[PDB]
Symmetry: D2
Subunit: 318 residues, 4 copies
C-alpha cells in the first residue's frame, strides 16, 4: 500500500509562515500546506515557493488554502496565525484566544493526531489555549520560544569569542525578555562554562551581562531596526528545527514551552513553561534538570507571569 | 585565505531571500546593503541568528555604505522601484536608471572585479545600465530573467505530466511575457521533446499552449494573488543558482541576459539579450544554439523591445 | 510513527557505500546484512560513529539474521560472488541463484512489502530470480544497471564538452556492455541532442563513438585499474538515487531493469528489460518511449541475451 | 578567474577513498587521489568522478602517482604508510613509516609548502611530528587527527545509552588513543548536564559510564576484531573532513587534535605535539589551553611520556 508523503501545515502565511515553508522545502521534509484567512495571498506565496523546486531539484509540493479541511492528515501543524499587538492586554488576549479557538477547532476536526508547534504570541498563554481548543494531548503540543533566545545567545557569544557556533551551547528556560532564565553555568563554549571563561579572564563579566541583556531584548532590537514588523528568519529556523526533530525522531533536547507536570521544578499544578524538552517521534516530553537557587528564583517570575495570564484567560472564557 | 563574499544591493524580499539561501548553502559571508535606515541591519541580524540553528559559521551584516562592498566576489542587485499605476514607463526608467547609477558607482569604486548579477526591472535595460555605470567587463555582468521562466515552465510541466522536476528541462530565450521565446523542440521530459509529446498525444497542444501562456504571465499571476508585491522566492532561487555556478565554477548553461556581440544570433550590434549563457569562474559567455526560423522571429520581438528601451534610456540620459 | 528502514543485503564495498550515502542523506535507519561473521557489525559500527560528526540521528546496525529485515521499507541486494577465472558463467549462476533463493526467502518471510532493488550480477537474470524467490509483485522489484551507465556517459560528456553535469542528460536502455542501447537522439547537452552536436561539428562522430564505447566498457575499465574488485561508488550512488525516488515519491524516470509486460516494446512475453522506469511511492512502472528501428534492433540483442539467461537459469533450477 | 579549491589525499586506501567521497559530496573542491600503487588511485578516482552527475556535482577527482600533482593544494590529507603487520617490531615499524613520512614530506615541501596538512598516518603520536619535520610546514599548518574520532565514538555510545540526539551530546577528550586517552568527564555533557552530574542524579549508572569510557578507549580495536581485515575508515574519514572543512570554511571550530603545543601550556617543559583542544580556522591551527583536574592532568602525563619516548626512538633512528 503506497506510503503517503509527510505533510506539514502552516497555519498563518505571513513572513514567518512563508519562511517555514521555504525551509521545509529545502530540507525536503514533506509536502507543505500554507493556510491563511486572507484571500489569494497564501496561494501566491505557495506558487512562488513551488517554483523554487525545479531549481533545487525538489519534488515535494506546496499549496495555498483558506480552508481547514486541507489540514487533513497533517503530520505537523505549525501555528503563526494571530493578530499583532493602543490595544489593551485584555483586548489582545481576547482577539487571539478567539483565533486560537478557530485554529484549534480546525485541528480538532481535521488532524487531531498532528504534532502541534505554536508560535503565536503571547506564547506563554497561546500554547495553552491552542491545546485547550484542539484537544491534542500534552505530548503533541509545544511552543517555540527558548530555541530562539538560545540561537540569539549563541550568536552573540560566537561573535564575541571568535569561535564556531557549533562549539557554543546556550541554555535557557522560562519565557522571553525579563522572564527568560539564562542557565549560565551549563551554557558553555567547547565544554568550558561561561562563568569559567569569566574566572579565567577570557570573557569580561560586563560583556557577559551585556550579551545576556541583549538576548533578553533581542526581538525588540530587531523590531526597532526593521521599522515594520518583527523577526522571522530565526523564529522560522527554530520552528523547523523542532519540527524536524519530531519528523526524524531525533530526540533533541531543546528549550520549549511544554506542559510540565506538578512536582517538576517545584510546580503546584500543571503549567506550560519554557523548559528543556525532548522532541521525538513520540512528541514532546519535559526534562527536569538541576538548577541553582538563583535560576529557580528567576524561573518563579515566569511561572507567576504565566499563572497571571492563565487567570486572565479563564476570566475571558467565562 | 579570505572567506568568499556576496553583497546584496537591495534588502527587499528578494534580497532577504538571496541572503537566506546564501547562508543555507554556505556560499560565503553576506553583506546586505540598502539605502533604508535600520532595515538591512535588522534583517541581517535576524538572518545571522539562524546560523547557530543551521550550524553555519558564515556571517551576514547590514549596511547603508558602499564601502562595505569592498572585496565582494559577487554582487546581486535588486534595488529599484517597482512600476505602479499610473506610472509611465518613462518615469520607471528615469527612477531606476538613477539607482543603477548610484549602484554602478558603488561597484566601480569599491569592488570593480565582482561578478555582477542584475535583477532590477525592467531587466531588459537595467543590466545594460548597471554595466555602463559600474564599468565592469562584458564577461562579469549578467541579468536574471530566463532561469525564472524556465523554473516556472518546469513546475507546470512536472505537475501536468506527473514526473520529477529533475526530468523536466525547459529552455527559453528572450525576455518575459510577450518577449519570451519558448524552445519546444529543446525542452523535454526525460529526453522526449515537448513537441514530440504532442505528436504522441501524451500532451495536448492545448495544454502545451496554456502552459506556455501561463509561463509568459507567471509573474503577473503571482502579483494578482499576492495583492501586495511580486514573486521573490523563485527569483531568489534563480539568482542564487547563477551565483553558485560562478562561485563553484560549475559551467552551467543557463538562459540569462548577457551581452551578445554583433554577428551572433544575427545581431547588427552588440546587445544584452536573453540567451543560453555559460556561467563559470571566468564569468559569463553567451552561447549560440541553432533555433528555428520561427523561434528566431520570436527572438526578434525581444530584440526590438531592447533596442527600443536602449533609445529611450539614451534620451533620458541626454 | 516508525522511522524509515533500509536493509542492505550484502556488506561488501557497494553495501558499505550504500549505507554511508543513506546516512548522509538522512533517508532512515539502516540495517547492514551479510552472511560473514563480524564484518557487517564492524562496518556498521564504523558507519554509526560517523553520525555525531554529521549531526545525524539515524542508526545503522549489522546482522547475520534475516529477522532483522522486518519492516524494511527498501531492501537493496548486493550479495553474491564476483565471477573469476576460470569459473564459468554457469558456475556463477549456480552460485548466485542460490544466494538469491536465500535472500528471496528472507525478504518473503520478513518484509514482503519492501521495495527491492537488485544489484547482484549478472543483473540481467538475478532480478528475475530475486522476484521469483521473494515473491514480491512486479511494481516492487527493480534492477540497477542503466543509471550507472547513464552516469558514466554523462561524466565523459561533461568533461569532453566542458559543461556542468546538470546540463548533460544521457539516456540508455538494455543492459551493460554490448547489450547497452545508447539513445543519441534523446541524450542532449543543455537541450541540444548529441546527434545535433555532431551535425554541428561541436562533437566529432569519432569522439561520440569513443565515449559510447567507453561507457560500454566502463565497468571493465575500472576493474582493470583497481586490479582488485570492481567499481562501487557510482553503483552505490545509482542505487541510492533509485531508493530515494521511491522513498521521497519523486516519480523520476530512470533506465532500470524492470518487468515489461508482453506487448510493450513488442515483447511476446513478459521480461525484465532495461527500460525507462518511473520510480515513485507506488513502486516502479516501465514506460514505453518511441525509439528508432536501429535502436529497437540494438535492444533485441539484450532481449535475446535475457531470454538466453532465462533458459540457462531454468535448466539449472531443474 | 578564481581557482577551485584543491584537496590532495596522499594515500588512496579505504580512508583515502572515503575522504575523497565526502569531499565531493560536501562540494569542498577538486580532489587529487595520490597513491604509490599503479592504477588503483586512478580506478578509484574514476569511480568517484562518476558519482558526480548523480549528485549534481561539478568538482572533479583524479588519480596520480606523481608528487607534482600536489601543486597548489589548499589541504593535504595524509593516510599513506605501512600498517603494523605481525610480527613487526616497533623499531621496524617506525623505521618504515619515518621513511614514508620523509618521502611524503618532501613532496609537500617541493610542491605545496603553503598547504594545510592533516596527518592520519599511524602511529599518529610520532608521525605528525615527522611529517612536519620533512615537509617544513610551520606549527599552525600541520595537525593530526585522533581526538575527533575518539569523541565521535564517545558521543555515539552516549547517545545510544541515553536515547538522545547526537547534537546534544558533547564529548571532550585529550591525549592519544587507548590507554593514553584522557576523558574530560566533567566537561563532557548532555544538553549542558555533565556526565558526572547525570550519575549523581541516577540518570546514568557509574558502571555504564565507565564501560562507555573503556569502550571508547578500545574503539579502533573493537572494529578491527569485527572486520577481520583492516581497520575503521568511515569515522576516521569523517573526522578528517570535519577538520579540513573548518579550515576551508574558516569555521573556528575547537576540536581535540594532535597539535604542536608550546612549552608552558599544560605544564609542558618543551614543545610537543599533543592531543589538545585545537582551534581550526583559515589561519590554520592553534592549541587552546583549558583547565583540567589534577586527575586528568596525571592522565595527560601518560600520553606526554609515551610521546617523549617515541620522539627519542625517532631521533635515534634518524641518527
Amino acid at each position: 500500500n503506497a506510503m503517503a508523503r509527510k505533510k506539514i501545515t502552516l497555519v498563518g502565511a505571513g513572513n514567518i509562515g512563508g519562511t517555514l515553508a521555504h525551509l521545509a522545502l529545502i530540507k525536503q521534509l514533506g509536502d507543505v500546506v500554507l493556510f491563511d484567512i486572507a484571500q489569494g495571498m497564501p496561494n501566491g506565496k505557495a506558487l512562488d515557493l513551488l517554483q523554487t523546486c525545479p531549481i533545487e531539484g525538489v519534488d515535494f509540493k506546496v499549496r495555498g488554502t483558506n480552508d481547514y479541511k486541507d489540514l487533513e492528515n497533517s503530520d505537523v501543524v505549525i501555528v503563526t496565525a494571530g493578530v499583532p499587538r493602543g490595544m489593551s492586554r485584555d483586548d489582545l488576549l481576547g482577539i487571539n484566544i478567539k483565533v486560537m479557538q478557530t485554529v484549534g477547532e480546525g485541528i480538532k476536526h481535521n488532524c487531531p493526531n498532528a504534532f502541534v508547534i505554536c508560535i503565536t504570541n503571547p506564547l506563554d498563554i497561546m500554547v495553552n489555549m491552542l491545546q485547550k481548543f484542539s484537544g491534542v494531548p500534552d505530548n503533541k503540543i509545544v511552543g517555540m520560544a527558548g530555541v530562539l533566545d538560545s540561537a540569539r545567545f549563541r550568536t552573540f557569544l560566537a561573535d564575541e569569542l571568535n569561535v564556531s557556533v557549533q562549539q557554543v551551547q546556550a541554555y535557557v528556560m522560562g519565557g522571553h525578555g525579563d522572564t527568560m532564565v539564562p542557565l549560565t553555568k551549563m551554557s558553555n563554549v567547547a565544554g568550558v562554562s561561561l562563568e569559567q571563561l569569566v574566572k579565567e579572564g577570557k570573557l569580561k563579566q560586563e560583556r557577559l551581562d551585556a550579551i545576556v541583556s541583549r538576548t533578553r531584548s533581542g526581538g525588540g532590537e530587531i523590531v526597532a531596526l526593521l521599522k515594520t514588523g518583527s523577526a522571522y528568519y530565526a523564529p522560522a529556523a527554530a520552528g523547523i528545527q523542532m519540527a524536524e526533530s519530531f519528523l526524524k525522531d531525533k530526540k533533541m533536547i531543546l528549550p520549549c514551552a511544554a506542559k510540565v507536570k506538578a512536582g517538576m521544578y517545584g510546580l503546584d499544578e500543571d503549567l506550560f513553561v519554557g523548559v528543556p524538552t525532548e522532541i521525538s517521534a513520540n512528541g514532546v516530553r519535559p526534562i527536569e534538570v538541576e538548577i541553582s537557587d538563583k535560576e529557580r528564583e528567576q524561573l518563579q517570575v515566569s511561572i507567576n507571569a504565566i499563572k497571571d495570564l492563565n487567570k486572565a484567560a479563564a476570566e475571558i472564557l467565562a
